[PDB]
């Protein structure tokens, strides 16, 4: 088999979108409220999540067919998938050696302990770390990583989605280019596509647990006041 | 003349309230999003204003009779006076030499230029600097400074105020202790009380200009997203 020019241009647009929205230098992290090592890590991690949401919006706008959707569908997909894309894209900084996300200096080295200092419990942090480990072990090509983010965002089974048909057609076209990429470009990846689809189910379960834990902190004004307007809007329950 | 035990205990409660809420070390300023020298100073100054609002709430709760008022009246007084109290209390860091607010290191030295980098124009910054200069030249005792803040906050002529009678009785009692303090404790202050009352009128005009300029930035989501939830709530138009 061989993949078409149409499938090849989808890949080209997605890796270009990811290169424009993911700053490998982590140079903007100095602009966030500093890390502090109750809920001492909440200001810094709220700033990091807020910055990541902007990057996800930027990536989403460069996905073919996303901008063409209605503003309501664009908002529904982002409000629902935002946290899953953040967890996926965070895998680029994840280190199997330290079991932490490393973003330049030791100031931006986030371990499991720093995340408990932002209000999270091991009911979320245990499956999240186990997710990062298994994702990293997949040794995904940049092409597969970006296709997975685009498939995750363009999921039609999200609350608020009106044009299910159109969104599923965009997601199916993205799954086809992923299956064909793995088949012809990934050596010994006969089981990879199925493993990647399982990671999407794991993300749904992580989103569930994150929504529960976020609800716990958003209901305490002394904690919610530490979040950013963008985090409040995106993780909010407004329809 | 001599002032009573009741007037003396009002003074004692107010300077104690101010000492509890005004950190002369400015040690928390390191926790704000760093200063950047469009609207590069907005994150840092939004964090500084947000922190100052919390300190004003803390001061207000220690004013005799404030906590006794209804939650609605407490909110109306703070939503209306918050920016005037911030401008008053900022006078402690103001330097006549540099024509700037100095808060420890040169990182927390705010000149007129840094404030334009947060969205403000000279239509506000010119009367604000001229206000700080004249306030500093009054050489107010700590007792007078704290009484002025309490009189400013307990103004009955604010939108949303229901118990005007009660609030005016609290403000009149505060004005009486100020007049008696200046008379018996401030040498050569026969013209001071009138000069202090004029500074309150100047504050109203500064609040007007600040509300206009804040409206200009709150209506631009790319700027309003840089504010904090507490700044949005307090400077907001919700009733």
């Amino acid at each position: 088999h061989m993949l078409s020019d149409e499938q090849m241009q989808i890949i080209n647009s997605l890796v270009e979108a990811h290169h424009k929205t993911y700053d490998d230098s982590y140079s903007d992290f100095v602009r966030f409220r500093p890390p502090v090592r109750r809920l001492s890590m909440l200001p810094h991690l709220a700033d990091l999540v807020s910055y990541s949401i902007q990057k996800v919006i930027g990536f989403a706008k460069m996905i073919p067919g996303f901008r063409d959707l209605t503003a309501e569908d664009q908002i529904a997909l982002l409000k629902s998938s935002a946290i899953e894309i953040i967890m996926l894209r965070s895998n680029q900084s994840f280190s199997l050696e330290d079991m932490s996300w490393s973003c330049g200096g030791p100031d931006f080295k986030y371990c499991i302990n720093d995340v408990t200092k932002a209000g999270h419990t091991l009911e979320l942090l245990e499956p999240l770390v186990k997710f990062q480990v298994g994702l990293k072990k997949l040794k995904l090509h940049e092409e597969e990583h970006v296709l997975l983010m685009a498939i995750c965002l363009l999921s039609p089974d999200r609350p608020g989605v009106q044009d299910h048909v159109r969104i599923e057609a965009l997601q199916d076209r993205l799954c086809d280019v992923l299956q064909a990429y793995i088949r012809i470009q990934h050596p010994g990846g006969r089981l990879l596509y199925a493993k990647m689809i399982q990671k999407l189910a794991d993300l749904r379960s992580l989103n569930e647990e994150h929504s529960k834990q976020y609800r716990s902190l958003s209901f305490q004004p002394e904690h919610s006041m530490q979040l950013t307007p963008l985090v409040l809007e995106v993780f909010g329950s407004e329809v | 003349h001599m002032l009573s035990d009741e007037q003396m205990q009002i003074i004692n409660s107010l300077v104690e309230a101010h000492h509890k809420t005004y950190d002369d070390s400015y040690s928390d300023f390191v926790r704000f999003r760093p200063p950047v020298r469009r609207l590069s100073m907005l994150p840092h100054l939004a964090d500084l204003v947000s922190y100052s609002i919390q300190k004003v709430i803390g001061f207000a709760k220690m004013i005799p009779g404030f906590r006794d008022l209804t939650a609605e009246d407490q909110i109306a007084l703070l939503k209306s006076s918050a920016i005037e109290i911030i401008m008053l209390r900022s006078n402690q860091s103001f330097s006549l030499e540099d024509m700037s607010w100095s808060c420890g290191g040169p990182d927390f030295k705010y000149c007129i230029n840094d404030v334009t980098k947060a969205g403000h124009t000279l239509e506000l910054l010119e009367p604000l600097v001229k206000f700080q200069v004249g306030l500093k030249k009054l050489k107010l005792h700590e007792e007078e400074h704290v009484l002025l803040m309490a009189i400013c906050l307990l103004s009955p002529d604010r939108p949303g105020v229901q118990d005007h009678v009660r609030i005016e009785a609290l403000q009149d009692r505060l004005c009486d202790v100020l007049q008696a303090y200046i008379r018996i404790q401030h040498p050569g202050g026969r013209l001071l009380y009138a000069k202090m009352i004029q500074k309150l009128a100047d504050l109203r005009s500064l609040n007007e200009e600040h509300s206009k300029q804040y409206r200009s930035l709150s209506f631009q989501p790319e700027h309003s997203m840089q504010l904090t939830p507490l700044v949005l709530e307090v400077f907001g138009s919700e009733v």
């Binding site: 902007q54 919006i57 706008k61 503003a71 664009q74 908002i75 982002l78 409000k79 307007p229 963008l230 809007e233 995106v234 407004e238 | 989501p221 790319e222 309003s224 997203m225």
Partner: peptide, 10 residues
């Protein structure tokens, strides 16, 4: 409402 989201989406 989604004022920020609407703005960021152009």
């Amino acid at each position: 409402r989604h004022k920020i989201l609407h703005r960021l989406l152009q």
